[PDB]
Design a protein around this ligand. Sequence first.
Ligand SMILES: Nc1ncnc2c1ncn2[C@@H]1O[C@H](COP(=O)(O)OP(=O)(O)OP(=O)(O)O)[C@@H](O)[C@H]1O
Ligand SMILES: Nc1ncnc2c1ncn2[C@@H]1O[C@H](COP(=O)(O)OP(=O)(O)OP(=O)(O)O)[C@@H](O)[C@H]1O
Ligand SMILES: Nc1ncnc2c1ncn2[C@@H]1O[C@H](COP(=O)(O)OP(=O)(O)O)[C@@H](O)[C@H]1O
Lengths: 247, 240, 401, 278, 56
Amino acid sequence: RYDSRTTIFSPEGRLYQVEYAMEAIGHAGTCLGILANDGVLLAAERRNIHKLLDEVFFSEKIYKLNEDMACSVAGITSDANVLTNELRLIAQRYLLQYQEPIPCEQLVTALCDIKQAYTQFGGKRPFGVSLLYIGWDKHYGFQLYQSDPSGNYGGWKATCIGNNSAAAVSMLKQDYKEGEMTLKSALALAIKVLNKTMDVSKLSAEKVEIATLTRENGKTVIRVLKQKEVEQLIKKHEEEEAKAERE
Amino acid sequence: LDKQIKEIKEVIELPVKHPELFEALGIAQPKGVLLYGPPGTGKTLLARAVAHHTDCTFIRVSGSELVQKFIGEGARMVRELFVMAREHAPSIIFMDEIDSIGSSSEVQRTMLELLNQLDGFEATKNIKVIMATNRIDILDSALLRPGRIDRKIEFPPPNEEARLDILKIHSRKMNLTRGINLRKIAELMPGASGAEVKGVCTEAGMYALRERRVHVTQEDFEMAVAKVMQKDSEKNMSIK
Amino acid sequence: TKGPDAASKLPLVTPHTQCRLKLLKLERIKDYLLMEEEFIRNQEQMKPLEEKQEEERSKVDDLRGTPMSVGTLEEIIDDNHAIVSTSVGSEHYVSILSFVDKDLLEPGCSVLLNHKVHAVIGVLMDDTDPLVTVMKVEKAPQETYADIGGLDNQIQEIKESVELPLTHPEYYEEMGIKPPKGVILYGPPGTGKTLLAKAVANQTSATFLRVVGSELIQKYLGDGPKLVRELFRVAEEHAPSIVFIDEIDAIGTKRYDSNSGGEREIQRTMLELLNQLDGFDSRGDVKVIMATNRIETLDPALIRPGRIDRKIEFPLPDEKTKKRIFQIHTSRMTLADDVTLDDLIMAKDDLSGADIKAICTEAGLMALRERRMKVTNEDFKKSKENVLYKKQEGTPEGLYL
Amino acid sequence: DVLPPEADSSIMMLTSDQKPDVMYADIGGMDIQKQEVREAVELPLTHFELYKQIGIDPPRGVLMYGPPGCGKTMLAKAVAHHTTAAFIRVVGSEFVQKYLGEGPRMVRDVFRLAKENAPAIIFIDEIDAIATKRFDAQTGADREVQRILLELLNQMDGFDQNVNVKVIMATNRADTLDPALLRPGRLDRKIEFPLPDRRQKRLIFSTITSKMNLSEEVDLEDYVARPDKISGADINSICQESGMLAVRENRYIVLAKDFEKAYKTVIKKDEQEHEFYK
Amino acid sequence: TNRPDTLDPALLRPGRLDRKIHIDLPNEQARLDILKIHAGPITKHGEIDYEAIVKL
Ligand SMILES: Nc1ncnc2c1ncn2[C@@H]1O[C@H](COP(=O)(O)OP(=O)(O)OP(=O)(O)O)[C@@H](O)[C@H]1O
Ligand SMILES: Nc1ncnc2c1ncn2[C@@H]1O[C@H](COP(=O)(O)OP(=O)(O)OP(=O)(O)O)[C@@H](O)[C@H]1O
Ligand SMILES: Nc1ncnc2c1ncn2[C@@H]1O[C@H](COP(=O)(O)OP(=O)(O)O)[C@@H](O)[C@H]1O
């Protein structure tokens, strides 16, 4: 009805196309992040697993936007690549101009402004991608942010974006503690959330991917856990579940 | 699904058997009950169950509408039907479709007549209605008003325990041998549709028949589970 | 001319509780009804003079056979040989005199005649289509206004339109203003339009007329609008009165072309109804009330001054009207002190009266489930959750605004 | 005196007495499908005491899915020819404009027929139009088909009016099929009808050519072991056209070159293409 | 008949519809023969340049 053109305004002040994009974000792999003071963690569900696929790349839903930040994406693949490239360009431009790393909020707001611009003109359709950013900077320590197709963004201590985000956020809000995670508890909580939300059982290590950003000797370290660490973590979670049995 | 049975009993049997309780309470007794199960499992089977212990004139309309067709009587489902039902003072009617005759053409005239007739404004009581359908949201809001319809009941897919219970129920006649483990069968068939349990049982029986035996085995039931489920896949649409 | 409804069996039961007054009040009512029964039980018993052992009547009995046929009185002839046709068009010029009053002779009015000699019997039958005579009602359902609460503006408007005219025209007469005739009540479903309709029906000095919108779909082609024309004629005949049409969005909707060519013909009914409502001639002294859920869909031609002089919206009670309805409903049931109606009222928005009735009933049912006749706040806490589950809306407008 | 009953299914009982006259062995190759459909329909209609002994509630719904021309309508015809039930197909896909929703108008009759004489069976393909998936509920004249499908579902599942009235659906490529009319208790047996493969083309060739002049020099093995995918309708057409080619030259017995010509003619693939689309 | 716009692949399959015959394109000489045939039941002088007429 009042659709097709991004520009038209529904008689109730609703931009239907952008809302359609927001909804359609739901057809995306699960992705979530947790603040976990002294560090920060990102995890995602590597859906669409097939025997023949090779997986030669280094992660698929996790990217290194910068020597101090990282981000994860959910939505159309082409738009994902476009936005990741743009983010890297923005970060490097700022570094060149000021000779200092880009604060996370500035990068987020720049990309979000691009998205809004796309939602503002009639030539083009809104970006159908939403993403999470995790980083550190001198101004505000560690930070986690979320950005949506409409162009709006926020900061959170923990949040999930894609697929069954509702259940994930419910569990997080009913289980997360403020200022006490210390990472390891964050990893355990993330694994539990993935286990519950993900359809597959036993949480095959191949299904999930995990990255963690921390500080050490004044430099940031952004390392993606390999198979062995995830195997140990999931084994620990399963053992704990068994321990809770009969008690 | 004991909870659903208890609720339906409360809303149907109690008012037509214990008016004193309600009148003492001082609250008008309920009239309308809606059954909406996304898969539809059990839905009017519950309907037939309540019909059995009806103790009152059980009316039922399930054939689309009936003669709602080219001219000869506009909205013949109503007026005459309800005066008939009210003639048999205690009675309950069944609308198995609840997807036709109202979702928002010339068809909706009869739906409006039905809504008016069921609503107040000189309407009597002692009648009750149960409606069966899937995806109630498409149903018109008017029919979803609390006044016309009071209780809404969803039939979620049975869990492992409910799946086991229904399997036991449909396996009473089966000559299951010693060794089968219904627990396992319930476990490895998540997302059951209720009717799927009866289906797996029947197909297992057929498997036993083909070999010309009178015994069913854990292997047979596992083959049954495999046969019942159907999977779909297609590559290069895995984007997003 | 005629009269109206004759229900109203002493609407003064005003304790509304288990008190000896209502035991005394109702036993007075039992006393006057038993005596009026006994007054008609022996009324005929007294004065054996049963029509003077009989006279005159024998003549009418013998002159007219046991069965009386009916027909249409055609052109009259002074010699009593007015032409009359039977149901099969059996036109016959036939004599017409017995002990029969020959002053109510009109073309087109049903007349009675003899089966064998076809002679006019006498009693020019005075009756109409039974499909409409059934609609006439003389039993007020429930209380007039006390039950309804919060719609002071709407009740004021409807009162001015209907009740005040047939109570005191002094203002209208002196100022020369003709009272408004047509009123269309509209709003979201369950707001209570039906409730107010019944309300006025309980306190209408004039005869009430009830019709559902989807009642003029007579199968046979044509006919139809004849139904509504006869209905209006009947209503006009029976003294002043009000005609109520529920769910009017079934006979008039945007008056769009046949399109597929099915020739639904309901458009013809709508046009005839509109003509009868306001076109040529004069309507007379008849009020009209219309109720529907969607009004915009109605075609403009039906909705205009002179046909619907008032459009009355029924909005969702916000807080005050909501509280009025809530405690009005809860009054007739035992409730606990701890209950906080205002708490629930504030907590929830976009709630209509039907939902209030449903939620109070469900709370009572849950309390009975717990085996406690008295209710508690927690009962309502569970009830409002159970009832308000079907509603699920809201686009992902949770961040951008 | 109450007169005997009147009215008749389709033209008459079993769609009149005109049986399709096809023998299961007369149509060979679909051994598996034959066995499955037989177990589904014939056994319960025939002695079902074994079913009771098992206590199985024999199924009443089975559909056969396969490309358009791989043995279907012929299988139903054979079932009609070698059954004892009052098989009243009479299910011409009826959009109609006046009488809408004749589902109950028919099934009830058949059930009335079923109890009148004995349990009946139904069969049809090209029901894909009625499949749909609901979607919009407002667009006028578009929801009539959904009303028809809902009436059909209600009649099929409905109530305990069982009389083992079996149903056969031969419209397939089941994606538009509503899950409502696809579930155990609903149409139960899903049986595939793949393209006649190697070792099946030989059976079909032998069965069709049984009654033929058979020059005795054409080796059917050449076509049996030859590549390329060909459905049974195509094989029958090939035989027919070979015979016509033979008769055209006033040749009473079909010769090998005639068979070769027929095979070449019937194989025409797209026959237009556009040299793009690859 | 060429009237049916829709053509059924099952019909054109060998058997049902054995073969299809395309109406030949008139060559303007078949036109001359047709004119002669129709010229038959016509009264005329006889000095008819039928070829000239068909070319006209
Ligand atoms: N848990 C269950 N208990 C009883 N019957 C069940 C159950 N699950 C499936 N069934 C079977 O499924 C059928 C339910 O019929 P019902 O009246 O609910 O049909 P419906 O509402 O039209 O939809 P559906 O075909 O999905 O049931 C019956 O055959 C019933 O025996
Ligand atoms: N404010 C109120 N005060 C008292 N009772 C109310 C109120 N609002 C609703 N009700 C009761 O709840 C019922 C539900 O609304 P109702 O059935 O009148 O629906 P409607 O859509 O307004 O009218 P209709 O049923 O004719 O379409 C009312 O008829 C009345 O009995
Ligand atoms: N026994 C048989 N074995 C193989 N092919 C057969 C057999 N009987 C018939 N055929 C061929 O296949 C057809 C079977 O019907 P089919 O074409 O599969 O139906 P539809 O394509 O309409 O679903 C016959 O008309 C004939 O062309």
